[PDB]
Amino acid sequence: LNLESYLQPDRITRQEFLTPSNRNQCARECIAGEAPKICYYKWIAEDYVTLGPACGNCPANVTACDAPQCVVANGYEKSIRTINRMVPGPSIQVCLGDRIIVDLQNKMAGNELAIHWHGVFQKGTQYMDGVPMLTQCSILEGDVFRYDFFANNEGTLYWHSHDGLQXLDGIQGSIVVRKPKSTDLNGDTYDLDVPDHTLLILDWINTTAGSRFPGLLQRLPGQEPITFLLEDRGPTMLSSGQLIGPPVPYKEVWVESGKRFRLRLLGGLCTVTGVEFSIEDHDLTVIATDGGPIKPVTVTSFVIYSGERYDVVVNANQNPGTYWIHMKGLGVFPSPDEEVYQLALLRYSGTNEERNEVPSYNGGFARGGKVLNPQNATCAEGEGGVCVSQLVASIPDKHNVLDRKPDENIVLGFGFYNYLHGPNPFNRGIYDRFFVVPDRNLMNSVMNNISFIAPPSPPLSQGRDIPDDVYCPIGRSGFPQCPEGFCECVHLFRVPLGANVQIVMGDVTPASDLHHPFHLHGYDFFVIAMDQFRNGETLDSISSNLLETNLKQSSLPARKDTIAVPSNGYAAIRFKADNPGFWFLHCHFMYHLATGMAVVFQVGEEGDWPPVPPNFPKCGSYQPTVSL
Amino acid sequence: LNLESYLQPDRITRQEFLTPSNRNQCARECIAGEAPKICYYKWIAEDYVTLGPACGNCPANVTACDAPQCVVANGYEKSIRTINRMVPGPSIQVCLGDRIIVDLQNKMAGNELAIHWHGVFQKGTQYMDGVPMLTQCSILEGDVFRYDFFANNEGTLYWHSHDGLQXLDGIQGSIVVRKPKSTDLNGDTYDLDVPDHTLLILDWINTTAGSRFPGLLQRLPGQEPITFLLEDRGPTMLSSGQLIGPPVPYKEVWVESGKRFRLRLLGGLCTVTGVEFSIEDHDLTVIATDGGPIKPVTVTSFVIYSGERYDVVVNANQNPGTYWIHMKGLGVFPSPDEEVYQLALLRYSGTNEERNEVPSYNGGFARGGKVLNPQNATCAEGEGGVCVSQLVASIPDKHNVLDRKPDENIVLGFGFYNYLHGPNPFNRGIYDRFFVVPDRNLMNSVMNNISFIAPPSPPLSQGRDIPDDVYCPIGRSGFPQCPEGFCECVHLFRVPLGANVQIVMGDVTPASDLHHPFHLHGYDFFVIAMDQFRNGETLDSISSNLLETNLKQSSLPARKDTIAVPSNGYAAIRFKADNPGFWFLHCHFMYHLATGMAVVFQVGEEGDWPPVPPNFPKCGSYQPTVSL
Ligand SMILES: *[C@@H]1O[C@H](CO[C@@H]2O[C@@H](C)[C@@H](O)[C@@H](O)[C@@H]2O)[C@@H](O[C@@H]2O[C@H](CO)[C@@H](O[C@@H]3O[C@H](CO[C@H]4O[C@H](CO)[C@@H](O)[C@H](O)[C@@H]4O)[C@@H](O)[C@H](O[C@H]4O[C@H](CO)[C@@H](O)[C@H](OS(=O)(=O)O)[C@@H]4O)[C@@H]3O)[C@H](O)[C@H]2NC(C)=O)[C@H](O[C@@H]2O[C@@H](C)[C@@H](O)[C@@H](O)[C@@H]2O)[C@H]1NC(C)=O
Ligand SMILES: *[C@@H]1O[C@H](CO[C@@H]2O[C@@H](C)[C@@H](O)[C@@H](O)[C@@H]2O)[C@@H](O[C@@H]2O[C@H](CO)[C@@H](O[C@@H]3O[C@H](CO[C@H]4O[C@H](CO)[C@@H](O)[C@H](O)[C@@H]4O)[C@@H](O)[C@H](O[C@H]4O[C@H](CO)[C@@H](O)[C@H](OS(=O)(=O)O)[C@@H]4O)[C@@H]3O)[C@H](O)[C@H]2NC(C)=O)[C@H](O[C@@H]2O[C@@H](C)[C@@H](O)[C@@H](O)[C@@H]2O)[C@H]1NC(C)=O
Ligand SMILES: *[C@@H]1O[C@H](CO[C@@H]2O[C@@H](C)[C@@H](O)[C@@H](O)[C@@H]2O)[C@@H](O[C@@H]2O[C@H](CO)[C@@H](O[C@@H]3O[C@H](CO)[C@@H](O)[C@H](O[C@H]4O[C@H](CO)[C@@H](O)[C@H](O)[C@@H]4O[C@@H]4O[C@H](CO)[C@@H](O)[C@H](O)[C@H]4NC(C)=O)[C@@H]3O)[C@H](O)[C@H]2NC(C)=O)[C@H](O[C@@H]2O[C@@H](C)[C@@H](O)[C@@H](O)[C@@H]2O)[C@H]1NC(C)=O
Ligand SMILES: *[C@@H]1O[C@H](CO[C@@H]2O[C@@H](C)[C@@H](O)[C@@H](O)[C@@H]2O)[C@@H](O[C@@H]2O[C@H](CO)[C@@H](O[C@@H]3O[C@H](CO)[C@@H](O)[C@H](O[C@H]4O[C@H](CO)[C@@H](O)[C@H](O)[C@@H]4O[C@@H]4O[C@H](CO)[C@@H](O)[C@H](O)[C@H]4NC(C)=O)[C@@H]3O)[C@H](O)[C@H]2NC(C)=O)[C@H](O[C@@H]2O[C@@H](C)[C@@H](O)[C@@H](O)[C@@H]2O)[C@H]1NC(C)=O
Ligand SMILES: *[C@@H]1O[C@H](CO)[C@@H](O[C@@H]2O[C@H](CO)[C@@H](O[C@@H]3O[C@H](CO[C@H]4O[C@H](CO)[C@@H](O)[C@H](O)[C@@H]4O)[C@@H](O)[C@H](O[C@H]4O[C@H](CO)[C@@H](O)[C@H](OS(=O)(=O)O)[C@@H]4O[C@@H]4O[C@H](CO)[C@@H](O)[C@H](O)[C@H]4NC(C)=O)[C@@H]3O)[C@H](O)[C@H]2NC(C)=O)[C@H](O)[C@H]1NC(C)=O
Ligand SMILES: *[C@@H]1O[C@H](CO)[C@@H](O[C@@H]2O[C@H](CO)[C@@H](O[C@@H]3O[C@H](CO[C@H]4O[C@H](CO)[C@@H](O)[C@H](O)[C@@H]4O)[C@@H](O)[C@H](O[C@H]4O[C@H](CO)[C@@H](O)[C@H](OS(=O)(=O)O)[C@@H]4O[C@@H]4O[C@H](CO)[C@@H](O)[C@H](O)[C@H]4NC(C)=O)[C@@H]3O)[C@H](O)[C@H]2NC(C)=O)[C@H](O)[C@H]1NC(C)=O
Ligand SMILES: *[C@@H]1O[C@H](CO)[C@@H](O[C@@H]2O[C@H](CO)[C@@H](O)[C@H](O)[C@H]2NC(C)=O)[C@H](O)[C@H]1NC(C)=O
Ligand SMILES: *[C@@H]1O[C@H](CO)[C@@H](O[C@@H]2O[C@H](CO)[C@@H](O)[C@H](O)[C@H]2NC(C)=O)[C@H](O)[C@H]1NC(C)=O
Ligand SMILES: CC1=CC(=O)C(O)=CC1=O
Ligand SMILES: CC1=CC(=O)C(O)=CC1=O
Ligand SMILES: [Cl-]
Ligand SMILES: [Cl-]
Ligand SMILES: [Cl-]
Ligand SMILES: [Cl-]
Ligand SMILES: [Cl-]
Ligand SMILES: [Cl-]
Ligand SMILES: [Cl-]
Ligand SMILES: [Cl-]
Ligand SMILES: [Cu+2]
Ligand SMILES: [Cu+2]
Ligand SMILES: [Cu+2]
Ligand SMILES: [Cu+2]
Ligand SMILES: [Cu+2]
Ligand SMILES: [Cu+2]
Ligand SMILES: [Cu+2]
Ligand SMILES: [Cu+2]
Numbered sequence A, B: 001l002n003l004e005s006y007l008q009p010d011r012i013t014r015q016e017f018l019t020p021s022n023r024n025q026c027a028r029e030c031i032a033g034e035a036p037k038i039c040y041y042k043w044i045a046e047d048y049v050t051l052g053p054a055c056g057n058c059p060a061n062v063t064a065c066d067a068p069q070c071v072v073a074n075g076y077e078k079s080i081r082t083i084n085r086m087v088p089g090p091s092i093q094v095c096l097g098d099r100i101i102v103d104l105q106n107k108m109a110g111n112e113l114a115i116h117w118h119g120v121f122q123k124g125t126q127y128m129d130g131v132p133m134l135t136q137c138s139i140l141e142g143d144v145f146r147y148d149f150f151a152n153n154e155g156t157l158y159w160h161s162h163d164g165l166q167x168l169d170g171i172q173g174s175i176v177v178r179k180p181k182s183t184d185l186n187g188d189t190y191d192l193d194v195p196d197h198t199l200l201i202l203d204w205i206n207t208t209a210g211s212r213f214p215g216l217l218q219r220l221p222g223q224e225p226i227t228f229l230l231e232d233r234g235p236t237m238l239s240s241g242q243l244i245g246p247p248v249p250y251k252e253v254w255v256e257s258g259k260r261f262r263l264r265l266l267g268g269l270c271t272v273t274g275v276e277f278s279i280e281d282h283d284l285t286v287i288a289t290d291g292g293p294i295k296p297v298t299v300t301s302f303v304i305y306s307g308e309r310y311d312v313v314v315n316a317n318q319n320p321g322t323y324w325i326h327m328k329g330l331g332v333f334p335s336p337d338e339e340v341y342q343l344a345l346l347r348y349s350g351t352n353e354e355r356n357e358v359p360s361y362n363g364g365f366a367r368g369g370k371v372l373n374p375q376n377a378t379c380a381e382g383e384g385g386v387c388v389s390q391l392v393a394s395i396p397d398k399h400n401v402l403d404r405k406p407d408e409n410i411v412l413g414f415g416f417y418n419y420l421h422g423p424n425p426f427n428r429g430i431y432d433r434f435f436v437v438p439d440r441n442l443m444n445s446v447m448n449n450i451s452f453i454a455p456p457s458p459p460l461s462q463g464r465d466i467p468d469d470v471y472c473p474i475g476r477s478g479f480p481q482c483p484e485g486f487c488e489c490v491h492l493f494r495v496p497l498g499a500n501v502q503i504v505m506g507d508v509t510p511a512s513d514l515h516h517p518f519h520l521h522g523y524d525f526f527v528i529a530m531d532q533f534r535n536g537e538t539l540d541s542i543s544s545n546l547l548e549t550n551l552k553q554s555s556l557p558a559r560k561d562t563i564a565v566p567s568n569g570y571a572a573i574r575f576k577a578d579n580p581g582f583w584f585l586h587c588h589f590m591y592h593l594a595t596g597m598a599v600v601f602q603v604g605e606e607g608d609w610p611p612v613p614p615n616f617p618k619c620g621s622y623q624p625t626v627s628l
C-alpha cells in the first residue's frame, strides 16, 4: 500500500463531512454495507506553547485564535505537549469496521510516549492498547511507533497519552466510531451527528502537570484546575463571572432551528473535578454512555468525570438566538469566590444575538429537572436524579452474564495511605512515593493496601522475562495480598478466559467529596449497583449480598467503561472476560493512577491472545552480574 | 560479588574522608600502589520538590535546611528532578583505577533517562557513555540500568542527565578521580584536597527547564537564570544585594589558617551564562583544567562556563575571619538592577566573624589582577588576562600530535537559523523546531547550516539497524553537507583510528555576547588557538593558516574537554583519535544542544571498539509494512 494515499486531515469542516471532496476521507456519514476504509494518521508529539508565534494577536484579534497551529486555551502562556500543534489533538472520525493506522513520532525532549485508545476493545490487537510496561514498551524520543487496529466497537471513544502526566499537558483527543444512521440503535433520535459536535470538556492548569507532582506544600498544594475549556478555549473567571485572564472568546456550538443534533461529550478532565453540564432552555436526550447505546432518557443536566463520555441530543426547538452552555465544576475549591466553571454559546444559524449578562458559577440551567449521574448516587424515589445503574442498554445480554451467578467476584477497597498518620517517611534514607493534596495531606494511593507499581517489561509480550517475585503474592483466599501502612507490587488478578466477573469497588478512605472514576481497559461492563455506605455496612457485606442474590438496579443495565464511585460509597460492575490479555483497571483521575490506584486483570494465558508481532520493541532492566 | 558490601554513601564528612571507618569507603586519600576498589552507587531518579516536607521550617530554621532529603536551592518552591533527593546529586569521590558501578533506577513519570560521565574517556566501555541514540537506548520509567566502567583518567570530572532538559531540573553532580598526593603532578601545591571543597556552581531558574522550551514569547522569553547556587544553596538577590527571596543561608567554605586547600570548581551551569569567580583577599593558584594538570598560574579571578572545571589552590594565609566568595554572572540580563550573581562565605576555623555589608553585583574581588579564561580572549600583551591557549600542560605530548601536520582538519561554523529572517514557518502544516530567546528571536541551532537530529537507534550498538539515509551525505569535499535556511540530519564525521585531528570552531552568527562552550566526549584535546574574528577574516582562512603553519599559542598547550569560544571568534583544538566509537561534539549550553548545536565523530569501524555487551538494550522505530 501507499499509506500516504489514506492520510487523514487533522480537522474536517461540517461541509467536508456532509459532502466529502475525497473518496478516501474517513470522517463521513457511514453507508450500510459499504467496504471499510483504511484511515492513516501521521502524528508528531512536540514540546509546544499556548499563544506564542502561531497565535499572532489572539485574543485581542479573535480570528488569530483560529490559526491551525495556535493553541489558545485560557490565554495564559505556558509550556504544553501537543499532537500536531492542537489541543485537543486531532479527532479520529471513522465508521465501524474501518482500520486505524497511526504513525506516532515522539519529538518530546527527555520524554517517553505511548497513546491509549480509551474504549477501543483491541480484541486481536492487544499489543496496540498503549499502556507502558503492560502492552508495550514506551516510545523513546527520536523513534516512531505505528499503531494498527480496527474500529470494531461503536461509539464516542477517546485517546490520550498513557505515559506519566502528559495528558493534562495536552496529549488527548476524541475517537468517534459512527454507525450508518439507519443501523444505529438510536439513529431515529437525531437528524445530524457532525464532527464539530464531538466536544471535549477539558480541565486546565496554568502550570505544567509535572509542576503539581509531587506538588508544592506551601504555595500551591494539590492538583486543582483553574478553569475548563470546551474544545480549545475558554476564559478564566471568578465565581461571579468576572474575568481574571485574557478575554479568550467562548466556544460556539452551532445548531439550526427545527433539527435535532447528536452532541458527543467527552470527559477530557484529568483532575479530580467533575462537571455538571447544562444548556439554557434546552433539555438533553441521553442516547449513549461511553459509546454504548441506551434507551433514551431526557434530563436537564448530567455530571461527567475523567474518562466518561455521554451522547445527548439537543432539539433546536427554542426561539432562535444565543443560549448559554454551563459547565459547573464539582469539587472543593480554594474559596466560594474562586469556584471553577466555564461557559460556551449555543448559537442558532441565521442569528447574531449578543448576551449581555455572564452567568455565574451558581447560574447553571439544571432548573430542578432530572440530573443524570448525580453526586452521591442521589437517585432514589423522589430525589430528582437518575443513576447510571438505573439506565437500560439498547442491546440485550448476548452471553448469559446477568442471568448466571458470577464465576469470579473481586472486591477492591481503593483509597490513600496518609503519611502524616504514621512515622515520618522523610530524611531516613528511603524513597516512598507521595503527592501533596490541597489540604496538605501527604498521600500514596492504594487498592487493598497495595500501591500499584509497574513490572520492568510488558507482560503481554515479555511475560517470560519478568521475575515472578514482582507480582503481589496470592494468599489462601485466592486473592493478591502484600508480601507497614501499605506495600508496593504488581497487583495482578488472573481470571480464566470466558469467566463471568463481578467487581465491587469501594471508597474506603473517603475525602473531599471525591467520586473516583474507575476504568477497565479492553472491555465495557454492566453497571450492577451503586450507592453510599451506611455506618456498620462493610464493602465485604455488600459484595457478598450482591453475589448471593444476583441483585441489579436495572433488568438490563447500561454498559459503561468508566464508573464514578459515589463519595463514601461503592459501585459493582459485571462483564464476560472473553477478551484475552493484560487489562488495566484504575482510577481515571491522573494523579491517582500516577500514585498507584490501579490493578491489572490477566484474562486467559499466553497462546489465548495473538503471538507477539515480528520486531515488536523489547525492554527491561540491564543489570549484568558483577564479577572480579 | 555481593555488590551491597561495596555500596558508597551519598555524602562523606571531611573527618570520614581523612580517617575512614570502613575499608570499602572509596572517598579517601589514595595510597600509591594500593589495590583498586569497587565503588557501588545505588541511585533513584525521582520527581521531587524544593523545600516541602523534608525541609521543615527551612530557612527560618537554618539547621532544617541541612536535612539529608531537603533541597533548599534559593528557597523558591518548584518541581525538580533528583538523584537520591539531593541537588547537586551524590558525588562520586574515588581514586584513579577504581571501578565505578552505578545502579540507576528511573522513577520519573513519563520521562526516559541516561546519565553521561562528563570527562571520563570510557576507552573499552564506550557503551557506558550515557548518550541517548548514540551509545545506548534511554532507560524507560520503571527500569534500572547498571553503568560499569573504570576511573582510568584523573581529575575533576562531572555527571549529568544527557536526556532532554533534566540537568537544569537537578540531575547533576561531581566525579573526583584523585591520585595519591605523592604522584599527582601538582601534589606539592596544596596540603588538603577534601570532598567538601569539590564545589559545583549551579545556575537556577524558578520554573522547570521544560517551561522554557520552546519558551514563552511575551511573558518570559529565553532561558536566563535568576540566581546561582554554590552546591545546594544561595538566596535570590538584586544587583544591589537586596534579597527578593527567602533568606536562604549563603554556602560556607571552611579553611584553616596556614594550610593550602585544593578547590575543585565545576561549571554546573546549564544556561548561556558564564560566571567570574573571585575570593576577597585570596589569590587563586590554578593547577588543573577539566581534570588535566597544568603548570600552576596565580590569578585573582577566573571565568567558567557550562561543562568546564577549574582546580584552584586557596592559601589560607590572611587574617583569620570571614571572606566573601563572589560569583558574577556574565551575560545579558533583563536590566542593570537585575544582574545575576551569588555569594558564599570563606570561613577560617576558630572564627565567627559576621560580615555586615553584602557585596553588590559589581563588588567582586578581581581587583585589576589577572583573569583566567577572559571574555573575548582578551589576553594579548598588556591586557591582564590569561587565555586557556596560553597555559602549559604538566604532561608532555606522548603521541607526536603537536609536532606533526594534522591528518584531519574539520571546520565547524556554529550558530542559529533565525526564522524571522525567512518565510513564516507556522500555520502551514509543518513542524520546524524552534526556541524563543530573550530578545524574542525564534531560533534553531546549526553547525555548517545543519541542525543535528538523532538516529532512531544508537549506532555504537545498532549500526546495522540504521538506514544510511539518516546521516548527512558526504560531498565531493569529503565533508558532510545538506541533502532552505537549514537542513536536519545525523551530522556524522568519520575519522580513522589513530588520526591526528584538528577542529576549528567559529561563532558565525554572533549574538548577545555568547561564549559557546564546545565539549568533545571520549577525549581531552590541546587548545591550539583562540581569538576574535577581524572583519574580512573567514573561518576558512584561519583554519587553512593554522593547518599549513602548525601555529600554537603555547609550546605545550593545556588539555581541556570543554572550550568557551570567544564571542564573534573561534577556537582550534587538536587530539589523537585513539579511542574508537561514536563521540558527541556539541555546545554544552543545554538549550543549544536541545536545538541541534552538535555533530558526531565516528572514530574507527565496528570491531575497533568492543563487541556489544550481552543483553544490551535495543531500540528503534516500529513501522511494520501495511498490506490489504
Ligand atoms: C456526598 O457525600 C459526602 C459524604 O457524606 C458522608 O457520608 C454519607 C454517606 C452520609 O452519611 C453523610 O451524612 C456523611 O456526611 C459529603 O461529604 C461530607 O460532607 C460532610 C458535611 O456535610 C463532612 O462532614 C463535616 O466535616 C466538617 C469538617 O470536619 C473536619 O474539620 C473540623 C473542624 O476543623 C474537625 O473538627 C473535624 O474533625 C474534621 O477534621 C465538620 O466541621 C462538620 O461538623 C459540623 O457539622 C456536622 C453536620 O454535618 C455536625 O455533626 C457537627 O457537630 S459536631 O459533631 O461538630 O459536634 C459540626 O457542626 C462535618 O462533620 C464530611 O467530612 C464530608 N466527607 C467527605 C468524604 O468529603 C458530600 O458533601 C459535600 O462535600 C463536603 C466536602 C462539603 O463541602 C459539604 O458541604 C458538601 O455538601 C456529599 N456531596 C454532595 C454534593 O452533597
Ligand atoms: C565581546 O565582543 C563582542 C563582539 O564585539 C564585536 O566584535 C569584536 C571582534 C569587535 O570588532 C567589536 O568592536 C564588535 O563590537 C561584544 O558584543 C558586541 O558589543 C557591541 C557594543 O560594544 C554591540 O554593538 C552595538 O549594538 C548596539 C545595538 O544594536 C542593535 O540595536 C540598535 C538600536 O535599536 C540597532 O540600530 C542596531 O542595528 C542593532 O540591531 C548598537 O546600538 C551599537 O551602536 C552604537 O554604538 C556603536 C559603538 O559601539 C556606534 O558605532 C554606533 O554609531 S552608529 O553606528 O549607530 O551610527 C552607535 O552609537 C553597537 O553597534 C554588538 O552588537 C555586540 N555583539 C554581540 C555578538 O553581542 C561584547 O560586548 C559586550 O556585550 C554586548 C552585548 C554589550 O552589552 C556590550 O556593552 C558589552 O561590552 C564583548 N564582551 C565584553 C565582555 O567586552
Ligand atoms: C487578525 O488576524 C488575522 C490573521 O492574521 C494571520 O494569522 C495570525 C495568527 C498571524 O500569523 C498573522 O501574522 C497572520 O497574518 C488577520 O487576517 C489576515 O491578514 C493577512 C494580511 O494582513 C492576510 O494575509 C494576506 O492574504 C492576501 C490574500 O491572499 C495576500 O495577498 C497577502 O500576501 C501578500 O500581501 C501582504 C500584504 O498584506 C504582503 O505583506 C505579503 O508579503 C504578500 O505579498 C506578496 O504578494 C505576492 C503577489 O504577487 C504573492 O505572490 C506573495 O506570496 C506575497 N509575498 C509573500 C512571500 O508573502 C497575505 O497573505 C490573511 O489572509 C488574513 N487571514 C485571515 C484568516 O483573514 C487580520 O487582518 C485583518 O483582516 C484581513 C482580512 C486583512 O484585511 C488585514 O489587512 C486586516 O488587518 C487581523 N486583524 C487585524 C485587525 O489586524
Ligand atoms: C530546627 O529544626 C531542627 C531539625 O528539625 C528536624 O528536621 C526538619 C527538617 C523537620 O523534619 C523537623 O520536624 C525535624 O524535627 C530541630 O532540631 C531537631 O529537633 C528534634 C526535636 O524537636 C530532634 O529530635 C529529637 O531527638 C531526640 C534525641 O534523640 C529524641 O529524644 C526525640 O525523640 C523523642 O522525643 C520527641 C520530643 O522532642 C517526641 O516527640 C518523639 O516522638 C520521641 O519520643 C519517643 O521517645 C522514645 C524514648 O523512649 C523513643 O524511643 C521513640 O523513638 C520516640 N518516639 C518516636 C517514634 O519518635 C527526637 O527524635 C532532632 O534531633 C533535632 N535535630 C537536629 C539536627 O538538631 C530544631 O529544634 C530545636 O533544636 C533541637 C536540638 C531541640 O532542642 C528542639 O527542642 C529545638 O526546638 C529546630 N529549631 C527550632 C527553633 O524549632
Ligand atoms: C493561572 O492559574 C493560577 C493558579 O496556578 C491563578 O492564580 C490564582 O489567582 C487567584 C485569583 O486572582 C488568586 O486569589 C487571589 O489572591 C490574592 C492574594 O492572596 C494572598 O494575600 C492575601 C492578603 O493580601 C491573603 O489573605 C491570602 O491568603 C494570600 O496570602 C487575594 O488578595 C485575592 O482575594 C481577593 O479577591 C477574591 C476574589 O474576588 C475575594 O474573594 C477576596 O475576598 S476576601 O475577603 O476573601 O479576601 C479578595 O477580595 C478583594 O478584597 C479587597 C479588600 O480586601 C477589595 O478591595 C477587592 O476589590 C477585592 N477583589 C476582588 C473582589 O476581586 C484572591 O484570593 C490566587 O491566590 C492565585 N493562586 C495562586 C496559587 O497563585 C491565576 O489567576 C491564573 N491566571 C490566569 C490568567 O488564568
Ligand atoms: C523566581 O524567578 C522569577 C522569574 O522566573 C522572578 O520573577 C522576576 O522578579 C523580578 C524582581 O522582582 C521582576 O522585576 C520587577 O518587575 C516589576 C513589575 O514589572 C512590570 O510592571 C511595570 C509597571 O508597573 C513595568 O514597567 C514592567 O515593564 C513590567 O511590565 C517591576 O515593578 C520591578 O521594577 C522595580 O524594581 C526594580 C529592581 O529594583 C527597579 O530596577 C525598577 O526601577 S525602574 O525605574 O527600572 O522601573 C523598579 O523600581 C521600583 O520603582 C518604584 C517607583 O517606580 C519605587 O517606588 C520602588 O521602591 C522600586 N523598587 C525597587 C527599587 O526594588 C521589577 O522590574 C521580574 O518582572 C520577574 N520576572 C518575571 C518573568 O516574573 C522571581 O522574583 C523569583 N523568585 C524568587 C524568590 O527567586
Ligand atoms: C488494609 O489495612 C487495614 C488496616 O489499616 C485493614 O483494616 C483493618 O482490618 C482489621 C481486620 O484484619 C480490623 O480489625 C481493623 O479494625 C481494620 N482497621 C481499619 C478498618 O482501620 C483492611 O482490612 C485492609 N484491607 C484488606 C483488603 O485487607
Ligand atoms: C551556510 O549558509 C550560508 C548562507 O546562508 C553560507 O554563506 C554564504 O556562502 C556563499 C558562498 O557559497 C556566499 O556567496 C554568501 O555571501 C554567504 N552568505 C552569508 C555568509 O551570509 C555558508 O557558507 C554556509 N556554510 C557552509 C559551511 O557551507
Ligand atoms: C485525599 C485527596 C486526594 C486528592 O486528590 C485531592 O485533590 C484532595 C484530597 O483530599
Ligand atoms: C541568539 C541567542 C541565543 C540564546 O540562547 C540567548 O540566550 C540569547 C540570544 O540572543
Ligand atoms: Cl474533526
Ligand atoms: Cl484475541
Ligand atoms: Cl493552576
Ligand atoms: Cl465523610
Ligand atoms: Cl561527598
Ligand atoms: Cl576500545
Ligand atoms: Cl526563572
Ligand atoms: Cl557583533
Ligand atoms: Cu483513558
Ligand atoms: Cu482505557
Ligand atoms: Cu481516584
Ligand atoms: Cu488506563
Ligand atoms: Cu557534560
Ligand atoms: Cu561529555
Ligand atoms: Cu551554544
Ligand atoms: Cu554531551
Ligand SMILES: [O-]
Residues within 6 Å of the ligand: A116, A118, A162, A519, A588
Ligand atoms: O486510561
Ligand SMILES: [O-]
Residues within 6 Å of the ligand: B116, B118, B162, B519, B588
Ligand atoms: O555533555
